[PDB]
């Protein structure tokens, strides 16, 4: 079926197989799911339906859509542009790491499976040469699994602080260059979709996830991992970090408030069904994130079983858990390098698809906002090449010895946290109060046939902005500092630059409001009347 195959190619992504188990391990195992389902009910469905309906209603780019819907709140589109730019800066480095693993994978003995190399330290141990072995005192002397040492000391060569940026890893630089040039090739030759290439490269991530889950539940000691994954602690629910990360993981994994969802709705015709597509896409995305959660947490439950250390500190708990649990799982497969290279090719494919659609949405939005310059002299591909070069040069700062901390900061503060919370707050406030929920419900009725069931309407009015403003205020008053490996206690200037770029991603709405008020002034009530009124026939 063409409908089933095309939809399944958009459910899976890196936000389900890499970011969700990271956020479910860093912010407590089972305590992460309680705000996850709450935001899935109250902010995934309503904001997803809102953005899909608005994108299909206006049927154009994602930043002029807000121009023709509500010209006062046009800064929401520019905030999504900044979020997309930050994402395209650091969404490609995961493909660089996955290429680097693919470089080392083609060997009859895996690099991350034995306890002797140029990078392994003295405190390593095989953890497989004997059943009882000689641990529980080597564990007291900080025993380390070989994959945990391999990642830290060869993949990125971690340094003891963000102030200790070491030499640039040249192999990783070549990996990033290869990722950017294959993304540019996908931009030029590869836009012509369908054929025999979609029947293979769409069900392959689900087959690989299914076989990885089937293996992961078979690993001994996975019962403790699943119990840690599911049984929650309320003391771990007391901090606002879990709530913030759950809500913005909901917003990130659904592409909500990124900016490409308004462009996705514009691709569909005016009479496409928003409600059913939104419901099934959101539910299937939550389900596949949940399944990848089972897989990674079962694997690290086995890791904690084979060590003497408990489940809470057995992996990095930074954004490399998918690069630690998954390389551990593929070692237990018979014919391990085959499954390893197929898995890393899966990661390359499902990261490249999202990067391609993100950069395509960004370039089509920036040439729609500048129509008379980039559509007359054959320079759209030149703009794409210049943007790729610029994001490669700005992206290389995270590939150094200490650049992992910079990547962690921008992952937690660019397409996450306060940026997504503020954009969703102002989006839902705009729709439910400025444009009017009755007018938008009438527009949805004209589009798809039936109005929203008024639960989504009340979510737009009082539920979603209320809960997101509550989470924002709760994060702001009970501030908890960010730690990389759960104990780092970042320097003050690192928090300064993180908050600076998080503000710069979300101060573009009040700045645009201020300059729109200043540019066209007719005193306050006439200004708000002429800015509240929508433009043309939309």
């Amino acid at each position: 079926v063409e409908f089933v195959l095309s939809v399944a190619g958009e459910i899976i992504g890196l936000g389900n197989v890499w970011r969700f188990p990271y956020l479910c391990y860093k912010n407590g195992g089972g305590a992460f799911l309680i705000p996850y389902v709450v935001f899935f009910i109250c902010c995934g469905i309503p904001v997803f339906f809102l953005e899909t309906a608005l994108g299909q209603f206006t049927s154009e780019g994602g930043i002029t859509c807000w121009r023709k819907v509500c010209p006062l709140f046009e800064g929401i589109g520019y905030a999504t542009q900044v979020i997309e730019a930050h994402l395209n800066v650091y969404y490609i480095i995961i493909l660089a790491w996955a290429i680097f693993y693919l470089s080392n994978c083609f060997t009859t003995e895996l690099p991350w499976a034995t306890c002797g190399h140029e990078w392994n330290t003295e405190n390593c141990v095989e953890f497989q040469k004997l059943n009882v072995s000689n641990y529980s005192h080597v564990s007291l002397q900080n025993a380390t699994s070989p994959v945990m040492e391999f990642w830290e000391h060869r993949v990125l060569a971690i340094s003891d602080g963000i102030e200790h940026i070491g030499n640039l890893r040249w192999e990783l630089a070549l990996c990033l260059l290869a990722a950017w040039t294959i993304c540019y090739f996908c931009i030029w030759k590869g836009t012509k979709s369908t054929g025999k290439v979609v029947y293979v490269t769409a069900t392959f991530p689900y087959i690989m996830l299914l076989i990885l889950l089937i293996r992961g539940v078979t690993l001994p000691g996975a019962s403790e991992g699943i119990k840690f994954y599911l049984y929650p602690d309320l003391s771990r629910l007391s901090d606002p970090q879990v709530w913030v990360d759950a809500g913005t993981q909901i917003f990130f994994s659904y592409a909500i408030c990124l900016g490409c969802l308004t462009a996705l709705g514009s691709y569909n015709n005016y009479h496409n069904n928003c409600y059913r597509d939104c419901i099934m896409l959101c539910c299937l995305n939550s389900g596949t994130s949940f399944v990848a959660g089972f897989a990674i947490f079962s694997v690290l439950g086995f890791m904690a079983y084979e060590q003497g250390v408990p489940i809470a500190e057995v992996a990095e708990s930074g954004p490399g858990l998918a690069f630690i649990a998954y390389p551990k799982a593929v070692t237990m497969m018979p014919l391990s390098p085959l499954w390893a290279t197929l898995f890393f090719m899966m990661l390359i494919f499902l990261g490249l698809d999202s990067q391609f659609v993100c950069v395509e949405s960004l370039v089509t939005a920036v040439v729609d906002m500048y129509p008379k310059v980039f559509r007359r002299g054959y320079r759209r591909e030149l703009l794409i090449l210049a943007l790729s070069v610029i994001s490669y040069f700005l992206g290389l700062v995270m590939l150094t010895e200490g650049g992992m901390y910079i990547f962690q900061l921008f992952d937690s503060y660019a397409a996450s946290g306060m940026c997504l919370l503020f954009v969703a707050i102002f989006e839902c406030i705009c729709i439910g109060w400025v444009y009017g929920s009755n007018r938008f419900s009438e527009d949805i009725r004209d589009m798809i046939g039936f109005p929203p069931p008024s639960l989504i309407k009340w979510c737009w009015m009082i539920m979603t902005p209320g809960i997101c403003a509550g989470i924002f205020i709760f994060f702001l008053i009970k501030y908890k500092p960010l730690k990389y490996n759960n104990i780092y206690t970042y320097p003050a200037w690192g928090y300064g630059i993180g908050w600076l770029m998080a503000l710069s991603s979300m101060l573009c709405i009040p700045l645009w409001i201020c300059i729109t008020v200043w540019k066209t002034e007719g005193t306050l009530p006439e200004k708000l009347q002429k800015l509240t009124t929508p433009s043309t026939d939309l």
Epitope: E442, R445, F450, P451
Partner: antibody, heavy 119, light 109 residues
Framework: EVQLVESGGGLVKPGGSLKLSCAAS????????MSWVRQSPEKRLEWVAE????????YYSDTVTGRFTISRDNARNILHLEMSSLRSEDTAMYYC????????????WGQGTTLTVSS | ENVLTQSPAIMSTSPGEKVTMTCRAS???????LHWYQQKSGASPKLWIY???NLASGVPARFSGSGSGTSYSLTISSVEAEDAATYYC?????????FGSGTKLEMKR
């Protein structure tokens, strides 16, 4: 429970005009769209006009477009249908149907006001 | 103008007998947009079957719509004296809205 009582209608000259009125009660009139469905004396049913729940999405059939206009009033819960240049072909009995969900149809219909155009 | 037609225009059924009407559409229509109405002799039509599968409030379960695409049908298990009326078929997919010619359910004795 829900009563779609209607008014207006009668005998009008050809080329004249008339103003039909639909009174809706027992439900939120501003939250459901409306339509006028006429019935020919040959018992042939056809749709005439449709106004949305807000009042800015208005559609007409190809046989009465241009000459027929449909109004609304969400305050007093009333509906209107004003026609111009009535011929002998659009004499019928007009119903006041209620259809908002397009997967539900005109679920609640009216009573019917007889309209006669003749010389 | 999705010109809907119905055959036969006139039919007569004895009570407790199999009967199946039809509504042939000129163009393709959605399976969840075609509806069926019932108008008694000298009364306003009421909603009977919506989205060609379901039944409205008060409709007995012996009515059952079927069909998809362009050919649609309305099936009745056992008719009685309480449902001798005229039935029309509508569509909301394309504008302008159209109705069927109308099948008259008659009785014989």
């Amino acid at each position: 429970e829900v009563q779609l009582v209607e008014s207006g209608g009668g005998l009008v000259k050809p080329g004249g005009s008339l103003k039909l009125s639909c009174a809706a009660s027992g439900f939120t009139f501003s939250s459901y769209a409306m339509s006028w469905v006429r019935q020919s004396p040959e018992k042939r049913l056809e749709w005439v006009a449709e106004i949305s729940s807000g009042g800015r999405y208005i559609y007409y059939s190809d046989t009465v477009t241009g000459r027929f206009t449909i109004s609304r009033d969400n305050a007093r819960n009333i509906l209107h249908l004003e026609m111009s240049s009535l011929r002998s072909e659009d004499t019928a009995m007009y119903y006041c149907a209620r259809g908002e969900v397009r997967q539900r149809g005109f679920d609640y219909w009216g009573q019917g006001t007889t309209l006669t155009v003749s010389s | 103008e999705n010109v809907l037609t119905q055959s036969p225009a006139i039919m007569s059924t004895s009570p407790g007998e199999k009967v199946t009407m039809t509504c042939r559409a000129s163009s393709s229509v959605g399976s969840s947009y075609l509806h069926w109405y019932q108008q008694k002799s000298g009364a306003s039509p009421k909603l009977w079957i919506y989205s060609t599968s379901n039944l409205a409030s008060g409709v007995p379960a012996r009515f059952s719509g079927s069909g998809s695409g362009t050919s649609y049908s309305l099936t009745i298990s056992s008719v009685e004296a309480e449902d001798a009326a005229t039935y029309y078929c509508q569509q909301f997919s394309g504008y302008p809205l159209t109705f069927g010619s109308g099948t008259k359910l008659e009785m014989k004795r």
